[PDB]
Symmetry: C3
Subunit: 178 residues, 3 copies
């Protein structure tokens, strides 16, 4: 069972401006675990070409938030509209793809933090060069006004000088709600 | 088919003192490969808060050893008792979850080493901060007085100063015995 | 469904000289995604022991190329002969294991580059030591005179001084053609 984006380069995401990016995301249910594959191409807007070195007002991090309602359907405040995730031809209800509430509990309180296990860290690379690292930080179930969430935080420390945000691929897994 | 711990924060592991830690471990059989998801929270004992900077006697590494008998059931000398791994509701014999003996051969001799392929390295992070790295080193079939083993070695180089051992999640895979 | 090498240490690969290496590669079909496990042992030839420090003519990178024909069968110019990948006993046509053409498009032109999403980066370690890093760079569908390809580029920056090329294991996933 697969929940996925399209695989073409057609944008499906708003980081800065409408349709400025393509998040390619493939979620494969393997029983209790979701096997996840993600990449990002930024096609337009201020993050298409990282110009941190000549624009000190440009941020060195952003989020792509997948905020799910209790049915496992994306909410309006997500970076991607709900039409852009679909099931692959057979061989709504996407609760089976949602991050497990017991493994990845919400913050209990307003003064409370999630456990670190709700997060995965990985290194990905811009423009297919190992000297352009970006930290991809993936956090489950840590967003206000949502039933479930997957948040992709992208951050970097180098003052990049006209580097296209064309990211390498990253694989990870998380424990499924059901 | 899944072999797993509970997903709650309840401790199941002894690193230093009884029940000082929760190793959350999810093993999903995907035919010839086990898809594995692991995190660690240390709740009590000397490693709950890393105080290397003010306690030079505190180690900068420890092991969590899963020593299996030839039936794929944990042995007494493991860091976790055999009750703490169970099969997930259907849709002992856990030999299907054991690390493959041909791919991950035991040391032949007393002067002999395993092949490096018996090991995976990953970086995880304490307290959900990228400046708190720990090396997670996972080795198959390298333990005395066991049929199979999975060893999780955690090590670090920074003299951490009151950092909670609350680890981010890590995904890996290994080749199954059958 | 699994497409795999043998798991023993028997060489199956030519980097420098005939049969100088064993690439252990396990490809598990999980619906739309291939779960991949890879390791490399170099048994003979100039890369068996990295002597960069005392042989400045020795390269600090090499490729293992799996060039597939449109049937998903290895081509002669690959580093491995087509006999060395087989299906695991049931429970040619390997197009189901091929990297997806829409997700991992070929270079359009002669002046054109692939998208970065065609590549995965990982760090592996020689002789099971964390101070012997090698960058493993895996690229899909980027080779001339092939229908599909998986290229494993191994590179390093340290002038290694008699370090055996006995690599740790690495897991990754990619999107399947069908």
């Amino acid at each position: 069972l697969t929940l996925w984006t399209t695989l073409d380069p057609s944008p499906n995401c708003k980081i800065d401006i409408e349709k400025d990016s393509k998040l390619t995301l493939v979620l494969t249910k393997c029983g209790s675990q979701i096997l996840a594959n993600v990449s990002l191409i930024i096609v337009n807007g201020k993050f298409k070409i990282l110009n941190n070195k000549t624009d000190p007002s440009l941020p060195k991090s952003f989020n792509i938030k997948l905020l799910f309602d209790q049915n496992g359907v994306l909410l309006e405040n997500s970076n991607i509209e709900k039409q852009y995730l679909n099931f692959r031809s057979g061989d709504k209800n996407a609760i089976g793809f949602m991050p497990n509430l017991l493994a990845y509990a919400k913050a209990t309180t307003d003064q409370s933090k999630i456990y670190a296990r709700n997060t995965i860290y990985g290194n990905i690379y811009l423009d297919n060069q190992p000297y352009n690292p970006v930290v991809i930080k993936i956090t489950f179930n840590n967003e206000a006004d949502s039933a479930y969430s997957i948040t992709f935080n992208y951050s970097w420390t180098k003052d990049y000088d006209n580097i296209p945000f064309d990211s390498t691929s990253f694989t990870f897994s998380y424990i499924a709600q059901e």
